[PDB]
């Protein structure tokens with residue numbers, strides 16, 4: 001797995017891939 | 031099971047633009 | 060809808076989504 | 090009507106690389 | 119021949135995240 | 148073809164498109 | 178859900194904004 | 199232009215539809 | 220158009236550059 | 241939050257799964 | 262290859278990491 | 283390398299095909 005800043009859409013799709021069937025939850029900025 | 035996984039990549043990505051900060055939830059079942 | 064700089068490809072796909080069936084026109088830099 | 094919409098997302102995106110500044114038009118019908 | 123080309127765009131993109139620096143190879147045949 | 152910095156994923160997909168059936172090889176940072 | 182409704186047929190941004198928050 | 203307005207600045211949805219057909 | 224020609228079968232960058240400008 | 245940790249800093253795979261369901 | 266194995270059915274990140282390096 | 287040439291600088295199409303197989 002990459003050592004990169006992940007930002008914006010690149011974050012969402014990555015979570016998309018990292019969670020798979022569990023799914024996920026993006027709050028954007030907290 | 032691809033064409034609903036490849037499809038969700040386009041969906042998740044579009045939710046990000048449309049909701050922005052509000053955020054979202056991506057799960058089912 | 061997001062409050063973000065949209066740049067490059069991220070601009071095109073967003074317009075893609077914002078216009079839908081109307082379609083659109085990208086000139087890049089003017 | 091998905092597989093031609095999901096497909097156009099890949100097309101629009103590729104036109105952007107290939108034309109760059111010249112720009113393009115994405116409509117039909 | 120689209121649905122395996124459009125599909126490889128999603129694959130190549132995911133390999134990039136998962137391998138990062140290690141790198142990869144994308145060819146067949 | 149664009150005159151842009153291409154980085155990260157944007158590099159891979161572009162090569163994806165530039166090579167077509169030949170395919171390619173990404174090393175990331177060398 | 179969204180997959181059944183947006184993958185079969187296209188959703189517009191407006192429909193997609195139903196799955197927000 | 200689109201780019202000067204929505205990349206080197208931020209753009210509303212509304213400001214973005216100006217660039218539809 | 221492009222959709223009929225690039226979605227059914229793959230276009231190469233070269234073909235796609237026909238829909239430019 | 242996800243963003244403050246993995247955008248304005250870098251995130252492990254592990255640090256990223258915290259944000260799964 | 263990968264196309265046959267990841268395009269027909271989904272691969273997970275773990276499977277995809279078999280095609281690395 | 284690809285990255286040092288086409289990310290931390292800009293790359294021609296030609297300069298990009300060097301990295302094909």
Ligand SMILES: Cc1cccc(O)c1
Nearest residue numbers: 021023056057058180
């Ligand atoms: C529709 C669906 C099923 C399983 C996981 C998900 O994130 C979404």
Ligand SMILES: Cc1cccc(O)c1
Nearest residue numbers: 080082115116117222
């Ligand atoms: C082919 C097509 C139809 C309708 C809208 C578009 O942007 C493109």
Ligand SMILES: Cc1cccc(O)c1
Nearest residue numbers: 144145146168170264
């Ligand atoms: C599977 C496959 C065939 C031809 C070219 C590629 O890059 C990959």
Ligand SMILES: Cc1cccc(O)c1
Nearest residue numbers: 040041044183187188
């Ligand atoms: C923008 C988008 C992507 C994928 C499916 C949809 O219905 C809409």
Ligand SMILES: Cc1cccc(O)c1
Nearest residue numbers: 099100103225229230
């Ligand atoms: C690069 C690309 C994307 C989608 C369809 C095509 O024919 C080619």
Ligand SMILES: Cc1cccc(O)c1
Nearest residue numbers: 128129132267271272
């Ligand atoms: C993430 C991903 C994309 C495309 C196909 C797959 O099997 C998995």
Ligand SMILES: [Cl-]
Nearest residue numbers: 007066154157
């Ligand atoms: Cl970026």
Ligand SMILES: [Zn+2]
Nearest residue numbers: 010068069157
């Ligand atoms: Zn990007």
Ligand SMILES: [Zn+2]
Nearest residue numbers: 036095099124
């Ligand atoms: Zn796709």
